[PDB]
Amino acid sequence: MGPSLDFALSLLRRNVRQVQTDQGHFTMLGVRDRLAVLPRHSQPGKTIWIEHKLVNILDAVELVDEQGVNLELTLITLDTNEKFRDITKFIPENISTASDATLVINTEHMPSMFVPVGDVVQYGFLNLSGKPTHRTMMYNFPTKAGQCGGVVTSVGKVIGIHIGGNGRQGFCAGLKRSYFA
Numbered sequence: 001m002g003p004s005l006d007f008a009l010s011l012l013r014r015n016v017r018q019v020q021t022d023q024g025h026f027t028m029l030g031v032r033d034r035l036a037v038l039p040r041h042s043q044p045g046k047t048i049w050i051e052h053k054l055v056n057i058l059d060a061v062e063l064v065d066e067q068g069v070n071l072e073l074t075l076i077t078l079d080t081n082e083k084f085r086d087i088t089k090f091i092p093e094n095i096s097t098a099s100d101a102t103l104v105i106n107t108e109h110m111p112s113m114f115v116p117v118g119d120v121v122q123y124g125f126l127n128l129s130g131k132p133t134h135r136t137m138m139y140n141f142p143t144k145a146g147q148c149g150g151v152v153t154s155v156g157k158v159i160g161i162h163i164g165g166n167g168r169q170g171f172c173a174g175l176k177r178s179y180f181a
């Protein structure tokens with residue numbers, strides 16, 4: 001097996017989880033220790049369904065930028081015995097573009113799903129469903145409902161979380177290492 005496949009599959013095994021909130025099915029990224037991230041609009045509550053069980057959420061932080069603008073990410077601290085394999089080193093210090101990225105999705109409906117989204121480019125400002133949002137990036141692929149939280153990956157890097165799409169193109173909230181410090 002080659003390297004990109006090995007990395008993506010290992011993400012699925014160790015870091016990318018099927019979840020369900022009152023808002024539906026999402027892909028969750030576990031980053032390190034008991035810390036994971038979801039799209040804000042998933043609206044995680046006091047508990048969350050993760051894979052085969054109900055998991056209590058100890059803390060939720062909805063990230064905003066310096067001007068108070070939505071970043072569309074919620075950091076959740078889980079009440080679990082597992083420490084996620086720490087993937088912070090794979091997350092760039094700054095929001096970074098990529099060539100020929102793969103969107104990795106893991107939901108009950110879309111389990112272990114790999115989607116070649118192509119190049120990922122800087123986008124910045126996006127108004128999504130009436131919520132102005134910052135630090136987004138864009139790919140020319142027609143992403144669909146059910147794919148939010150999907151992990152944007154390229155060449156051993158983990159660069160965004162899928163948050164929306166307009167039927168022709170898809171958008172992620174960009175990841176930076178400091179979010180998870």
Ligand SMILES: *[C@@H](O)[C@H](C[C@@H]1CCNC1=O)NC(=O)[C@H](Cc1ccccc1)NC(=O)OCc1ccccc1
Binds near residue numbers: 162
């Ligand atoms: C995952 O929840 C979902 C994925 C979308 C649906 C169709 N294709 C996709 O990739 N995301 C949404 O439906 C978001 C939800 C949202 C996000 C932030 C605040 C509130 C709600 N909404 C969305 O994608 O609207 C369509 C859109 C997106 C970007 C520009 C124009 C229109």
